[PDB]
Design a protein around this ligand. Structure first.
Ligand code: HEM
Ligand code: HEM
Ligand SMILES: CNCc1cc(OCc2ccc3ccc(N)nc3c2)ccc1Cl
Ligand SMILES: CNCc1cc(OCc2ccc3ccc(N)nc3c2)ccc1Cl
Ligand SMILES: C[C@H](O)[C@H](O)[C@H]1CNc2nc(N)[nH]c(=O)c2N1
Ligand SMILES: C[C@H](O)[C@H](O)[C@H]1CNc2nc(N)[nH]c(=O)c2N1
Ligand SMILES: [Zn+2]
Lengths: 405, 404
């Protein structure tokens, strides 16, 4: 009947229609000829204005004053500002709304049930790399909260015409070093080889552990990036042990508490925030499956399987599956023991299903990237696997941006 | 124009140029991607061009493009369509077409096997009774005492203004699902509807969890007929577990032969509404989806309790632990019974090789990531880390409406 994508849940037999996708102003990578959904990575005053008008409309709607005098005056104010400066500036509450809407709009995030609970730190007054470090340390302190983790974003000054960007060079605020060895292998996190060598080129004295916390490379406008070492007491980590396998603790594994992505671009109303780090808490599979077991990450699956005395000589023993499960259990158990916020992939996907239903009512749909939403272990054991999803780009948005170097 | 395809484990990059050969629209648009949807929302010059294109594919395959035989065949097809509005395939063309359709199936992880397919021509079928004989032979051939062999049986194509030949069941072997009035379902819930259709067409039902359904076979414009498969034809594997002695006591089992029977085979514009095909199972289909899906046999909690796991909380990973043991039991049991089966690691590893073979052969390979990646231990398999391009090539297997 309805001229909108029909979305089915095959577990429950229920049907919805996504009408929200009609609000998408930006094309993705797919066409009627081929679907590129699995691909990881696929102003003129006029363009800015329409984006800005769209956002201001979004803002006034969200506060139920659409069509009002203050709405029309804000529109006039934004246009006039662009008229004389080529850009414009957000009011504080507009920044807060946009930051939250960016998260709410993120198709790849399974944690969006939490989207309304986001502490927005306005750092648009920051004017140095040293000052960025202060703001970041404060973010880490607040967000970590001794293990009772709190979602937060710190927004630094927006991209400005004829002036360099504020950039955090590191992909997350907390990252383990990856040291390339003489034998070609990697000690530490192979994901972080490039940033590690960049840190060294910039005067960092490197360690040689598997879990050396990297220093921050922070870049203020039109300046070389400066190197900042995080005070270790600010960086909460959890040593990994297993509830029953006593040898697991002897592996010396660990992960940091705070997932704090820092290389993403926050776009709101056409304004571009090139440095706006944000953090929540981990879903246990990110650490236990991906970071610890990916072939091109720590790759600990065989080591653990051997300790479990599994038959690693044949696929059909399911040694990989068994080990992966116990590694994930260790992550959950250790985070719980340490009283550091974490969520398993069952609890998380269940809560995302609740989120989908909320957004169905609130907005007529929810953009979602099935491949990213479904967890990397136990896929069909979670409800989201059986849930069809429509993927599309809404704005405000978090966007990938090229590396500053 | 041409999609850049990256593998994130190895850093390697391909470019898919095969997708330019797609003549059929999928469900995605620039505005929104619908790749996770399971089913699609919904003259003679058209047929003639699909026909020419296919005959072209065929003669290129035998390396005789531009040969007089190729040219003569094109005129044959053209002459037949111009006169009758349709045409017919030579057996050798049908055999090529069927293999290509498997090859082009974006959702199939087992396509490394594509060139190895026994094709039974059943186009000289005029009755449900004859369909039954062909089906029995197919099952006999394909089962081969546990040494499974991939096969397809092809029934007469669709004709204008005439009902279709159809097999009503979704697979040649399916377990009954009986809806007990107390809300529940005994058996396989996926088969409630087909079970009920069977009963209304005269089948005396069982009352078990693994009662093998009769086939409802339909010749054109006739009511379907009921046929009970001879039990000796249907090979089943009792499930036990290598170390957990109690597992066998669950009374679990599954059939050897996965033989899908409700898909339509399109070749060169011609449509074969009844063309059942079979290979062998990947263990996760049985151990994860069929046995553990909440809307299937849903045995997770039962197994977990037997393993004395803490069911109270999600964070004990009782679901993940139980699922792994069930998958192991399926593998163990099939191996013990000498019945062909492939685990999801072996399967996905061979699929990566297939992607590589196809890159060299055709310049790409249509694949549906969401279906290729197994339902447990996704990122533990190489396909998780492989970008894939999805699109429709012909010959193709397609979904079609239920005939009732
Ligand atoms: C509060 C608890 C949260 C949980 C459990 C959570 C969970 C996740 C997970 C599992 C992913 C997939 C990441 C990967 O596989 O690498 C993800 C992605 C993402 N998250 Fe959330 N998240 C949370 C909070 C947040 C917050 C506070 C923000 C921003 C305000 C956010 C924005 C995003 C974005 C933009 C992505 C996509 C990343 C990409 O494409 O690279 N998340 N999230
Ligand atoms: C020989 C061993 C084979 C293996 C191990 C295998 C594996 C699989 C698996 C795991 C799926 C996903 C099915 C599901 O989740 O329900 C699938 C789908 C599919 N397979 Fe294969 N397969 C094999 C042979 C074949 C053959 C012989 C054909 C046809 C001649 C075929 C054509 C297809 C098609 C068309 C689909 C998609 C069905 C749909 O979209 O619902 N496969 N295969
Ligand atoms: C393109 N950058 C890839 C990349 C993504 C990363 O994480 C994505 C991401 C983003 C936001 C998250 C929020 C919460 C959470 N638990 N995980 C989250 C994970 C981390 C490092 C890199 Cl290098
Ligand atoms: C309409 N229901 C869809 C459906 C799809 C099914 O599987 C598709 C399918 C097709 C070919 C296969 C080949 C081999 C294999 N192991 N599984 C295969 C699975 C099975 C039953 C049903 Cl009921
Ligand atoms: C090729 C594929 O898109 C890629 O490996 C994706 C798949 N799904 C994912 N899902 C999440 N949550 N995170 C990821 O990094 C990925 N990687
Ligand atoms: C909604 C989602 O697309 C649906 O559950 C799909 C996901 N991937 C799948 N993959 C396979 N192999 N088989 C399936 O039935 C499905 N179902
Ligand atoms: Zn798509």
């Amino acid at each position: 009947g309805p001229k909108f994508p029909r979305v089915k849940n095959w577990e429950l037999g229920s049907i919805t229609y996504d009408t929200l996708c009609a609000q998408s102003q930006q094309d993705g990578p797919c066409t009627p000829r081929r679907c590129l959904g699995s691909l990881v990575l696929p102003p003129p005053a006029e363009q800015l204005l329409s984006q800005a008008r769209d956002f201001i409309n979004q803002y006034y709607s969200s506060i139920k004053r659409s069509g009002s005098q203050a709405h029309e005056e804000r529109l006039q104010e934004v246009e006039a500002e662009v008229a004389s400066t080529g850009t414009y500036h957000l009011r504080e509450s507009e920044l807060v709304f946009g930051a939250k809407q960016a998260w709410r709009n993120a198709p790849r995030c399974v944690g969006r049930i939490q989207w309304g609970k986001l502490q927005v730190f306005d750092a648009r007054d920051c004017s140095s790399a040293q000052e960025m470090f202060t703001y970041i340390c404060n973010h880490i302190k607040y967000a970590t909260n001794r293990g009772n983790l709190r979602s937060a974003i710190t927004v630094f000054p927006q991209r400005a015409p004829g002036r360099g960007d504020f950039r955090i060079w590191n992909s997350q605020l907390v990252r383990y070093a990856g040291y390339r060895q003489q034998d070609g292998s990697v000690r530490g996190d192979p994901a972080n080889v490039e940033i590690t060598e960049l840190c060294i080129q910039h005067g960092w004295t490197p360690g040689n552990g598997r879990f050396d916390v990297l220093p921050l490379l922070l870049q203020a406008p039109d300046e070389a990036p400066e190197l900042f070492v995080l005070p270790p007491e600010l960086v909460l980590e959890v040593p990994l042990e297993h509830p029953t396998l006593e040898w697991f603790a002897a592996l010396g594994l660990r992960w940091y508490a705070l997932p704090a992505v820092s290389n993403m671009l926050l776009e709101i109303g056409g304004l571009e925030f090139s440095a706006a780090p944000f953090s929540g808490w981990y879903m246990s599979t990110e650490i236990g499956t991906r970071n610890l077991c990916d072939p091109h990450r720590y790759n600990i699956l065989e080591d653990v399987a051997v300790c479990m005395d599994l038959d690693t000589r044949t696929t059909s023993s399911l040694w990989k599956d068994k080990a992966a499960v116990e590694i994930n259990l260790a992550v959950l158990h250790s985070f719980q023991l340490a009283k550091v916020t974490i969520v398993d992939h069952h609890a998380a996907t269940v809560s995302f299903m609740k989120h989908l239903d909320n957004e169905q009512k609130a907005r007529g749909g929810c953009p979602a990237d099935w491949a990213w939403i479904v967890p990397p272990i136990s896929g069909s054991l979670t409800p989201v696997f059986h849930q069809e999803m429509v993927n599309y780009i809404l704005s405000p948005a978090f966007r990938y941006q090229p590396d500053p170097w």
